Write a protein that binds this ligand. Structure first.
Ligand SMILES: Cc1cc2nc3c(=O)[nH]c(=O)nc-3n(C[C@H](O)[C@H](O)[C@H](O)COP(=O)(O)O)c2cc1C
Length: 167
């Protein structure tokens, strides 16, 4: 029912995808590491969760970068799309969560209806390509600075998405 497509450099978004899966049900969510994925794998789901950390100051994580150049080959109309990222707001206050911002911008143009928007309250940052009229395009996690907050963030966003998705 939901395909969660994640990239990871140092394992944190992956560890977070697993918590997400387990919050919905591991029956409801299928995980796909986008290092092993085909862009046409995204066609298999009408409900997508897109996980990407921002790397090297504002860049997509390297596996998502590879897939990004082909998002063009896919039709996202009729799909509902949620985004999550891991990032470091203290180290990169100017580019916090840019990657999910970049991914959503593209997937949105190609058809996908974004669900899963999230309050910027309680984050300390200057700018982000994830910002959308005062909210983040999706769940912003910081395992570097706010890891005590992650569990309850995920529980709360997942409950939100169960509603947005119709589950
Ligand atoms: C050199 C480098 C550059 C980074 N740049 C950003 C950034 O621009 N924006 C951001 O939010 N986080 C940035 N981060 C933090 C990572 O996104 C964060 O550590 C994330 O949890 C990594 O996810 P991963 O473990 O799944 O690869 C950067 C981290 C490193 C080491």
């Amino acid at each position: 029912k939901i395909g969660l497509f994640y990239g990871t450099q140092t394992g944190k978004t992956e560890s977070v995808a697993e918590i997400i899966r387990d919050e919905f049900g591991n029956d409801v969510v299928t995980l796909h590491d986008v290092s092993q994925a085909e862009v046409t794998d995204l066609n298999d789901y009408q409900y997508l969760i897109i996980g990407c950390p921002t790397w090297n100051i504002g860049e997509l994580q390297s596996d998502w970068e590879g897939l990004y150049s082909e998002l063009d080959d896919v039709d996202f109309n009729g799909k509902l799309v949620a985004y999550f990222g891991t990032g470091d707001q203290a180290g990169y206050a100017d580019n916090f969560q840019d990657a999910i911002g970049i991914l959503e911008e593209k997937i949105s143009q190609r058809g996908g209806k974004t669900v899963g928007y999230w309050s910027t309250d309680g984050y300390d940052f200057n700018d982000s390509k994830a910002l959308r009229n005062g909210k983040f395009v999706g769940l912003a996690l910081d395992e570097d600075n706010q890891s005590d907050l992650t569990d309850d963030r995920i529980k709360s966003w997942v409950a939100q998405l169960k509603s947005e998705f119709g589950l």
